[PDB]
Amino acid sequence: MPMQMFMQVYDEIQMFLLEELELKFDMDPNRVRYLRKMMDTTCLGGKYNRGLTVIDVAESLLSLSGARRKRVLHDACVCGWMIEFLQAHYLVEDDIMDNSHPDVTVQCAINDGLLLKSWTHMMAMHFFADRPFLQDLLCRFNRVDYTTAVGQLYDVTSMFDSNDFAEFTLSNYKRIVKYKTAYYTYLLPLVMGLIVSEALPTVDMGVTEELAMLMGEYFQVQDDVMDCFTPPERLGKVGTDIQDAKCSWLAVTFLAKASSAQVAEFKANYGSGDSEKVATVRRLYEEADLQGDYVAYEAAVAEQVKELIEKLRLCSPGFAASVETLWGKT
Amino acid sequence: MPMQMFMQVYDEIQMFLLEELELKFDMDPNRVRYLRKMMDTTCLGGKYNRGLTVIDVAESLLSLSGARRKRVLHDACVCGWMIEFLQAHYLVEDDIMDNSHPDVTVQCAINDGLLLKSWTHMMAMHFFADRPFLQDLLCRFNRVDYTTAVGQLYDVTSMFDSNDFAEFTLSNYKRIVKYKTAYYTYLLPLVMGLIVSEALPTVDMGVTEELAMLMGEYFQVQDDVMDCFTPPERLGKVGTDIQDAKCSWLAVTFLAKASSAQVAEFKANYGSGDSEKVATVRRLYEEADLQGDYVAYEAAVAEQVKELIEKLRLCSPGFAASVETLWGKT
Ligand SMILES: CNS(=O)(=O)c1cccc(C)c1F
Ligand SMILES: CNS(=O)(=O)c1cccc(C)c1F
Ligand code: NA
Ligand code: NA
């Protein structure tokens, strides 16, 4: 039912956006069908975990506060697609960075990214035109864009000096995870579920933001390990954190328990595309028993998650049930 | 005074944004100074015509409706910088398309473009937090982004078939100018001047949008001609409309008054980077007496502008005076 309702609202949102382009933006049918195909290609096919979370939080809050039910669930679907469309946007953005007479393909790719971003605003300004939370919803969506852009600056410049392994620390790793993933992957769907449920002031934002920290930290540590050791066919992509010299969990944990000679060998091989240099970094990670610390680190973070849900349970019981479901997905 | 007040508010907006990053976004001083330099580099140095227009419209409307004066003029400066910051954003975006081990310069350039875009929202959500027009201002700013993105799709795909000179017409040229330049360059500063002056419903939006059409059309026709004939040192850049096969005013006007043999020669040379092929296109433009039609076309459009200002004068006299000043700049 939640997935079935989520897909029906997609056709409703798609038909509005495309008809609006045809009726108000003077768009020819060729470009309309081109945009329908590009919208289906970039927005569909995922798991919709962050779009379905908005629905699960909304339905968990109407069970413990007829016509208002259909409105909140429909608003939560439009909100869920704002998140999926936003993720569809960055999916195309994650291709412009590793792809390179004007090139029309690069021009169309940049344009697709701009359209996917604008569609989130257009669907919100339409379906929420008479909602009292429209202004607050647009403001919180601008803040998550700023947070993500700031998180990218931290992630990209973690090995240089913005006009180098000094920033390869555990607190700076948390800072990157906080602004690049945690606030984006987990806080955004939960907060918007509270907005459409009119139960935003009924929850502790500090406890909610802290839950997103640990859940985003748990997920990013797992991603960093899989990016290094999981083979490409089983991971779904080619792990390149070592070649790109990313400030990963494996890097900052290794630099803490390694000898001076091992750090010198790490610094000499980290950040290169050579096959044996990357293999040298994997050997240094293996010999340092990092996968033993990975189990203890993930268990300790999970312990903090299971206990923080109960603090939020005391004031918002229905909200905590939906956070337990999202936490199960990670 | 208007330029002096506009620059003081810049330091106020810059200091808020940077201190906010330091105090709320956990940014180190190295990256703060890096962002101050990048903000100064991308946002300053222009002519500020579209930022100063907001001030001129605001001051022309308070003269014909103490504490409210200082508020409206300050709000108009923040609004003016939202436009200049937005233009600063596309200045960096106009470099990613013609510029191309992760490349850190391309990553920083994409990040700069995202930050410049987010800064427009952050300065609006801060200085207009208690203004009743904050929601309407954010909505109109989302629509101009959609309009610009749609205008780029029309401009980029004017010679292909979105999954070819058929779209090389005068009405389609106006469609491109409308969404890519007219609504962006001229309607945006005027409307925001009306917002901060609380005089939005007091004007005819249809007459106002129509004025932006003709003024944007007048300016784009002049740009298309200068891009072709004005030498690089006098133009300020290297004109490349012929090589990029742009749907320019010269192209659609030539195709209407040319013979079949001249159109065949045009189609054989248009859209190539060869020196003599581009020179062949310039010769075809010269021999067709296009610069004689350019004078008549610009005069006819200017006649429609001078007469449309008087229709708007009948209901909004102060608004028309500021539109006459902006029209003088073009
Ligand atoms: C305090 N919450 S917020 O600023 O509205 C917000 C919500 C969701 C995600 C982010 C990054 C965010 F900043
Ligand atoms: C009707 N006006 S609008 O939609 O708010 C608007 C204002 C300025 C520029 C653009 C493109 C725009 F669409
Ligand atoms: Na998702
Ligand atoms: Na300007």
| Cβ count within 10 A of residue B292 | 9
Candidates B214, B140, B225; CA nearest to B177 is B214
User: What's A179's DSSP letter?
Assistant: I
Would the CB of A140 count as within 6 Å of ligand 1?
yes
> Any known ligand binding at A94?
yes
Task: Copy the structure tokens of residue A32.
Answer: 């309309």
Sequence-distant contacts of A257-265: CB under 8 A, at least 24 apart = A257/A288, A257/A293, A258/A284, A258/A288, A262/A288
A180, A148 Cβ separation under 8 angstroms: yes
- Cα dihedral B38, B23, B125, B140, rounded to 10, equals 30
Residue A95, annotated as binding a ligand:
yes
B136-150 core/surface letters (b: 16 or more CB in 10 A; e: else): ebbbbbbebbbbbbb
What is d(CA B174, CA B182) in angstroms, rounded to the nearest whole number?
9
Q: Is B60 exposed, middle or buried (CB count within 10 Å of its CB: 0-12, 13-18, 19+)?
A: buried
Overall number of domains in chain B? 1
Look-up of token digits 């979105």: B162
HSE, CB side, 13 Å, CA atoms: give it for residue B234.
Answer: 7
Q: Say if ligand 1 is within 6 A of residue A190 CB.
A: no
Task: Calculate ∠ Cα A68-A70-A72, nearest 5°.
Answer: 65
Which residue in B63, B46, B57, B111 sits closest to B79, CA to CA?
B57
Please count the other Cβ atoms lying within 10 Å of the Cβ belonging to residue B11. Answer: 9
Q: Quick count: other Cβ atoms within 10 Å of Cβ A69?
A: 12
Q: Say yes or no: A150 contacts chain B, CB-CB below 8 A.
A: yes
Q: What whole-number distance in Å separates Cα of residue B253 and Cα of residue B288? A: 9
Backbone angles phi, psi at B167, to 5 degrees: -85, 5
CA geometry: angle A192, A196, A199, nearest 5 deg: 90
Report the gap between the CA of A153 and the closest CA in chain B (Å): 7
Length of chain A: 330
In 3D, which of B180, B236, B245, B246 has the Cα closest to residue B213?
Answer: B180
Other beta carbons less than 10 A from residue A74's beta carbon = 18
Residue A185's region, left for phi above 0, alpha for psi from -120 to 50, else beta, is: alpha
Q: Which of B189, B147, B246, B250 is nearest to B53 (CA)?
A: B189
Nearest C-alpha neighbor of A203 from the set A43, A95, A322, A297: A322
- Of the candidates B70, B75, B72, the one whose C-alpha atom is nearest the C-alpha of residue B318 is B72
Sign for the pseudo-dihedral over CA of B159, B161, B166, B167? negative
Vertex A47: Cα angle to A43 and A48 (nearest 5): 65
In Å, how far from its chain's centre is CA B167? 23
Report the nearest atom of ligand 2 relative to the CA of B188.
8
Residue whose C-alpha is closest to residue B263's, from B281, B241, B246, B276: B281
CA atoms within 13 A on the CB side of B52: 13
Nearest-angstrom CA–CA distance, A267 and B308 = 69
The residue nearest atom 2 of ligand 2, judged by CA position, is B140
User: N- to C-terminal Cα distance for chain A?
Assistant: 22
Mark the breaks in chain B: residue after which each occurs, C to N over 2.5 Å: 65, 100, 163
Q: Would you give the DSSP letter of residue B45?
A: S
Ligand 2 touching residue B143 (CB < 6 A):
yes
**Torsions phi, psi of A47, nearest 5?**
-95, -20
d(CA A167, CA A158): 6
d(CA A24, CA B214): 19
Q: What is the dihedral of CA A7, A8, A11, A13, to 10 degrees?
A: -90
Three-point CA angle A257, A263, A265, nearest 5°: 135
Q: How many CA atoms lie within 13 A of B127 on its CB side?
A: 28
User: Is A107 within 8 Å of B100 when comparing Cβ atoms?
Assistant: no
User: Burial level of B231, CB count in 10 A (0-12/13-18/19+)?
Assistant: exposed
Residue holding tokens 């469609």?
B175
CA B247 centroid distance within chain: 18
The best mutation among B191, B204, B326 to test binding of ligand 2, ranked by most ligand atoms within 8 Å of the C-beta, falls on B191
Report CA-CA distances (Å) from B214 to B121, B163, B224, B226: 29, 32, 15, 18
What secondary structure does DSSP assign to B204-254, as a single string? -HHHHHHHHHHHHHHHHHHHHHHHHHS-HHHHSS---TTTTT---HHHHHH
Rounded Cα gap, residues A330 and A302, in angstroms: 10
Q: What's the sign of the alpha-carbon dihedral A100, A102, A108, A114?
A: positive
Please, what is the Cα angle at B45 between B326 and B318, to 5 degrees? 20
- Cα separation, B55 vs B193, whole angstroms: 7
Site to substitute for ligand 2 among B142, B145, B147, most atoms within 8 A of C-beta: B147
Helix axes A104-127, A2-24, angle to 10 degrees: 110
Q: What does the alpha-carbon distance between residue A164 and residue B243 come to, in Å, rounded to a whole number?
A: 43
- In A181-240, the residues whose Cβ lies within 8 Å of chain B are none
Domain that holds residue A29: 1-330
Whether A88 contacts A48, CB under 8 Å: no
Optimal mutation site among B103, B138, B180, B241, interface A, most CBs of chain A within 10 A: B138
Is B30 part of the contact surface with chain A (CB cutoff 8 Å)? Answer: yes
- Give the closest of A21, A101, A134 to B273, CB-based: A101
Q: Can you tell me the distance from the alpha carbon of B45 to that of B237, in angstroms, rounded to the nearest whole number?
A: 16
Place of tokens 């990313």: A246
| Cβ proximity of A266 and A254 under 8 Å | yes
B172 closest CA partner among A18, A115, A27: A27
The Cα of B268 is separated from the nearest Cα of chain A by a number of Å equal to 15
What distance in Å separates the CA atoms of residue B170 and residue B226, rounded to the nearest whole number? 19
SS3 A324: helix
Q: Is B187 in the pocket of ligand 2 (CB under 6 A)?
A: yes
DSSP string, A99-160: T----HHHHHHHHHHHHHHHHHHHHHHHHTTT-TTHHHHHHHHHHHHHHHHHHHHHHHTTTS
SS3 (DSSP) at A161: coil
Instruction: State the Cα–Cα distance between residues B225 and B211, nearest whole angstrom.
Output: 22
Residue whose pair of structure tokens reads 């409210």 in the numeric block: B68
Please, are residues A126 and A16 in contact by the beta-carbon 8 Å criterion? yes
Whether B295 and B302 have beta carbons less than 8 Å apart is answered as no
DSSP A245: T
Whose tokens are 């007091």? That residue is B202
- CA distances in angstroms from B171 to A26, A67, A228, B246, listed in the order given: 11, 47, 55, 15
* Residue A104 contacts B where some CB pair is shorter than 8 Å: yes
CA-nearest of A239, A312, A317, A311 to A281 is: A239
Nearest Cα residue to atom 11 of ligand 2? B144
Radius of gyration of chain A (CA): 22
Enter the tokens of residue A150.
């700031």
Contacts of A152 (CB under 8 A, 6+ apart): A180, B107, B111, B114
CA gap A208, A51 in Å, rounded: 18
Of all residues in chain A, the one with the smallest CA distance to B143 is: A122
Contact B175 A122 (CB under 8 A): no
User: Which of A27, A30, A138 is opposite residue B138, by nearest beta carbon?
Assistant: A138
Resolution (A): 2.1
Q: Could you tell me which of B107, B24, B32 has the C-alpha nearest to residue A157? A: B107
Return the percent helix, strand and coil in chain A, to nearest 5. Answer: 80, 0, 20
Q: Which residues of A touch B34 (CB under 8 A)?
A: 162-163
Residue of chain B minimizing CA distance to A104? B156
